[PDB]
């Protein structure tokens, strides 16, 4: 029980010796030396029941007070903590492998929590305050963070940090997990190896990136690939790969490298596939040009619920780009570029599936035409609590991209898969 | 093996003797002499397995390290190497006639390579660094260099050097290799020198620029041609050629000269032709002015599949400018300006052919009319699967541009070619 009182006393001693009002003096290393020295002196002269390990913990606590995260660190250090939920200054919950509970860890004042949030979002050039009270971000270490500000959240700031995890699913494993039936697996293998301009839509918490990695695992080795990401998540398994990443705006908000610029420059490096981590703004435009001007195989992910919404969102982005294009031109361009859309989503019971495998057919006036090959038609739910479905097939005798399949001589296997699935 | 260690020892000896800070001290010949002598002496001062030939080779390597481009030079010195792609420090890809191969070449570290890239891009006044990590410029010798710095990239410095090809086909190659029969070839040759406007439409990868270059090959030498392009690709032999190029906008967002401004200005240089590299923005309207106000002989290229689709695209472009023109005056303008719309396409099988040599006849009501002279019809397939067809002339007697061709005494040749086609 001596931890809290002894810590308060030691903090007061350090402040009397070197107080935070002395900012710009006793810098990183100077602090790491002087604070530790004063802590050791206080422990020696001032009797404290804390041990050498406890002395080091108190030293680190003072260091945190100086430039720290706050009391999150003793939590983050663990591994069983799979989620950290703040919900104001007076509460911190955690999930521990299936169970969830409250914790006897708290903040002092909403200033402390607010400052900690501002700092942790400043780690990746993000700032949350009374002007932009919402901030979502992904820290470099891999885990994701979200924060809401006082003006909206009536309980002061609210913050959530989700533990990082690794999937690295493979197409041979997806079939066992019942994500896609084997006929679908072969069809997708053909669609991936055949350099088809596709777009992997997905809904909230659907898990697109895993699917995108699983699909790009089909590319032929020699092809010079080029990605454009914001977090460095993927793991390509090909020899000839070039990676990239944007650089957010500096503290002054200047000299930023938006994904648009990365794409516009990747257009000039002689790439064969321009994979993209996600689509957020007018960069879609450039990517669509890459989909069209002889870079056949470009992938990409955007946040949409169903394909006939994904198309509308693409059009809305292009319009927002501020180019002045009439809508009909945008529809013509999309119909020309895109070739396949794989819409994956999470059903009610929490599973993950692939609900649609659609092909853009053409334009007829002001309506785009789609010919969904597959649809995960829901059939029911079992007594054990998990939904049941089946991968029905519309069984089109010859999909649009048949020509490509021919050019690579893989058409026969695709035909076999269709025949099996058509029945 | 021992070349690495011997080179390391000799390089340390050279730095001790002459430091890179001594640049311009012991000027180029002076360096090649003094450093060579120092290396020769250190060969005996410090024992090494290198013989006299080894001494000379290591002297050359030291010289290249002092000023040279390093292991790039053995490649860049060659001619049968098209593109060089450097990712990281332990990977360099070279393109050799339509294929990529991974080099056995290496480097020392990433900072080495980054300084080398800075040297390479210094030649055009540009600068690449952590503050402007994107560089794209045309080296004076003609090649095009694009470099992305490791602040954006991950594996290391990203470098792409694209060499200017010198192999651009003439009509002879196209005719001989199943692109156009001696009928269409001679018709196009008559169309070229006859100073007839035209708008070459093309499909994805249909190879528009090659056709455009071949057509321009026939232009009259004594005409003041004034190209315009987004990136140097055309190659003309006429004595009188002014070449212009757009300037891509910089990251800061200022100092950009688009194709529109360039054509606006080319209208005021007393030209006698205009050859636009590709017509994408609204610049089409200005180009049409050149087709109209006594600059007969303009050209262009645009993206489309069907000549009617090409004309629809041109109307869309003209409307994009927002000048407020109605929808009928645009059609009047396009009917009075254009005089040939050639369509070249890529066969489904994986080969290219020239398809349409359509013209523009007039405006009947509110729709444009065409009188397609030549065509290419898909008979079927061979035992191997390649598409086959025939180049056919519909048999028109006096084309619209015939009157114009009357001036240049080509009429007899055109009549003869069409007659031979009709036979």
TrEMBL record, chains A, B:
Q: Which UniProt keywords apply?
A: Metal-binding, Nucleotide-binding
Positions that bind Mg(2+) 1: 209, 233
Superkingdom assignment: Bacteria
Residues reported in the UniProt entry to bind ADP 1: 144, 205, 207-209
Which residues make up the binding site for ADP 2?
165, 205, 207-210
Q: In its UniProt entry, what is this protein called? A: Pilus assembly ATPase CpaF
The organism that produces this protein has a lineage beginning with:
Bacteria, Pseudomonadati, Pseudomonadota, Alphaproteobacteria, Caulobacterales
For ADP 3, which residues are the binding ones?
179, 207-210
Q: Which family does it belong to?
A: Belongs to the GSP E family.
Instruction: Specify which residues bind Mg(2+) 2 according to the UniProt entry for this protein.
Output: 209, 233, 278
> GO terms for molecular function, please?
ATP hydrolysis activity
- Domain (Bacterial type II secretion system protein E) ranges: 69-343
Decide whether keyword Metal-binding is in the record: yes
